[PDB]
Design a protein around this ligand. Structure first.
Ligand SMILES: [Mg+2]
Lengths: 471, 473
């Protein structure tokens, strides 16, 4: 179970994937993972530029679905082509919007292609709703040029209808015919196409030749139109700039979504350095999360939050681990100011009995063996769940082996000997969480240096004073 | 501050008991089951033992009850519904005669089953095994039936001769004949109810109208006289004054049966009540494959302290004892092989489901023990002193334990705080215990170790192959 799942990283993915406008944005968000450092700094620069300069996005997913269908040999039965062409037209308009900015957004937009040869071919063929126009091919215009007067002349020749005794021309099997009355059917010699039983659609002999011509022309129309549409489909397949444009569109969707996550969750851009320093940091997934400030550097490598148990100790562990993980993946981080180191590997021992203590020792054991001076360790509930005497003896040895490593991070425990160990030791400082006695609730507030409550609480709950004299 | 039966998952035991009831009546008693007066509880114990000794069937009382309540409301009951309620009473009297010679607590209950012979002898005369009213139920109905049978047979209507569709049919319970359309003459009688498309006409000829008029007036006279008999039998059930007492007796016998079914299926045994607690091979009935343990509390050793880091079953023991007391006080058998139990005035459960908020929550329950509990009380405390300073919490926890030892309360306490197991040695009335741990499998066993102070910490680290240069520098 990787540290991403322990620190609830995939919930940050799902919040990010809420704000993606396109499926391409969602796929990047839902696969998001920590990055090499100077790529992740580019995402931070992109996120800051997106906050300054918002932009719209085309329908990249519908473009990609049409683009995939065209590559597969399907006649991309347009429009669909017009929707795909309109996405490319908006993509190019998006590109020329971002280029003058002369920044990281403009560099991403440089991968948006020149799709004018596809656009001009489409717009000369079909531009208004995806009806294939007459002039899309010279053959089709000639075929249309006989379709209109032949179709009108059939309707002109069907009065006829106006000699006789239910007074509308209709199509059956895409041939023109007339609804005679069943008794009067001898007045209109023709061919029976349909009856309703409730009558007698008859195609008169005089329009049989015209309908035979009209049917024959419509076959030649449809054969040419599909030949045009298949040609347009293979243009979209053979446009080599589409995948690079789609990659740019997907990345710009992710960056804008990252900006929205920073806007909504109150995130700020981290800066990277040789040490940890966070000012008013919080856990972004906790509503009304309370801000705490702390630092880790080479002089003080490990922070030991020696409590009575929690009221926010485990949350502060998950706060620091998320901030480093979200910074390394190019997101902003949940603080007002954050200076962060770059750990090679983040170790989190986070989950209270003897066999939960055994689970803690496994992740500590990997922590002992393989963590380096560049690593970041998050250790929860250290020494709890076992014998408090040998548990403190084991925990102190593990801590000073990690101090001997040079590793950085935070450790929480409630074992009394360890709080005196940290005060009498280099490289580790004590901390605690302030508890509100008047309300009997934790304040979730870090107190930097003061490591108690028990009789004080028993007073406030008004236990008998005879009990609370022998104490 | 909610009830201690909720904490011990007692309503689960209610649901399991109601699953084994035969009737809604015994289901209703199961779901309202509460700790009882002690004389009532021992009667339930002796009932449950005798129901184990002699299994018995139950009627469906509950079809009886709902039919009886409708008869009180003045509705006319159906034929088969009256028969079904009669069969409930008939089997109830058979159950009474079955149980009475036993001359025990079951027979004392079964006296409340009434004598329903006058209602039954009305019923068996009136209507058959299927709920149809016989001819002889009233002389009027016999006369009406004696005119129905020949008249209904006499409708031929074999008028063919002519022709159709081969079959005589009924429309509005009037016999009619399916002449094919276009032969509406020759077979006149164009009085009809219509039909679809060609097959049609369903004619009554102008011969059988007269003896469809009669045989329809007769069916009206039949319906009224049948319904009068049905209503009269419905009211006689309502006027039967022994039905509510019989339903009361049957419903208790359903509850006693389910308790016997509960004790068979959960491996429960009849508790004995006395001045002290002694459990042999006790287990939590809601835990599958539950682990047996034995423990005893008396006035010499009031409080058993289970001191140890473990999960084990430290809490499940607290539930095991407390649920056993509450089931015993409810007239249920308890989850042990042998169980001597005292009768506490109150049971106090300090159980959660650990840190400053929950430590304050424990003290708010522990306040009630320090205020209200008497020397007869049973106290169950979980996680004593945990979630706070190991120094100052132990001093507070030892102070509370000293107060409870002066009070004379009996019960069971869990902690992991080291001074307390040093305290339990050399103090009267409190005794150490602990949970065994399986080092080689890294599981709690689950079982309790009496008397040995409770770890394992460095053994776990050596088991898990932590580096030896780490271990105690
Ligand atoms: Mg009569």
């Amino acid at each position: 179970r990787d540290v991403l799942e322990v620190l609830e990283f995939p919930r940050v993915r799902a919040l990010l994937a809420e704000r993606a406008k396109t499926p391409l944005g969602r796929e990047l968000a839902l696969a998001l993972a920590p990055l090499p450092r100077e790529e992740a700094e580019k995402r931070h620069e992109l996120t800051g530029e997106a906050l300054s300069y918002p932009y719209a996005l085309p329908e990249a997913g519908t473009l990609r679905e049409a683009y995939g269908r065209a590559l597969a040999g399907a006649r991309l039965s347009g429009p669909e082509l017009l929707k795909a062409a309109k996405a490319l037209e908006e993509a190019m308009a998006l590109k020329e919007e971002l280029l003058p900015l002369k920044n990281a957004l403009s560099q991403v937009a440089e991968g948006i292609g020149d799709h004018t040869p596809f656009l001009e071919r489409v717009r000369k063929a079909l531009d208004e709703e995806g009806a294939v126009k007459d002039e899309a091919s010279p053959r089709l215009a000639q075929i249309r040029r006989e379709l209109r007067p032949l179709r009108q002349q059939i309707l002109d020749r069907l009065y006829a209808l106006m000699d006789r005794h239910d007074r509308f021309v209709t199509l059956r099997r895409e041939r023109y015919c007339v609804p005679v009355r069943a008794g009067m059917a001898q007045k209109v010699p023709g061919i029976l196409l349909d009856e309703s039983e409730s009558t007698l659609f008859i195609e008169p002999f005089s329009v049989v030749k015209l309908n035979n011509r009209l049917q024959a022309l419509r076959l030649k129309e449809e054969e040419e139109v599909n030949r045009i549409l298949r040609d347009l489909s293979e243009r979209l397949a053979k446009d080599e700039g589409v995948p690079k444009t789609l990659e740019a569109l997907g990345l710009l969707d992710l960056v804008q979504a990252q900006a929205a996550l920073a806007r909504d969750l109150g995130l700020s851009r981290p800066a990277f350095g040789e040490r940890y320093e966070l000012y008013r940091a919080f856990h972004p997934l906790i509503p009304d999360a309370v801000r705490n400030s702390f630092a880790l550097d080479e002089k003080n490598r490990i922070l030991l939050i020696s409590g009575p148990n929690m009221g926010g100790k485990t949350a502060l562990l998950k706060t620091l681990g998320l901030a480093v993980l979200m910074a390394q993946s190019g997101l902003f981080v949940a603080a007002e100011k954050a200076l962060l180191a770059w750990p090679d590997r983040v170790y989190a021992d986070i989950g209270e009995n003897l066999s939960t203590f055994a689970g803690h020792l496994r992740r500590l054991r990997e922590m002992l063996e393989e963590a380096t001076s560049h690593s970041l360790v998050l250790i929860d509930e250290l020494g709890s769940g076992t014998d408090p005497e040998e548990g403190a003896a084991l925990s102190q040895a593990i801590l000073e082996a990690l101090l001997e490593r040079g590793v950085k991070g935070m450790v929480t425990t409630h074992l009394s000997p360890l709080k005196a160990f940290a005060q009498g030791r280099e490289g580790i400082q004590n901390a605690s969480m302030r508890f509100d006695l008047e309300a009997l609730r934790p304040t979730y507030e870090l107190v930097l240096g003061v490591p108690s409550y028990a009789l004080a609480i028993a007073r406030r709950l008004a236990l008998p004073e005879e009990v609370l004299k022998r104490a």
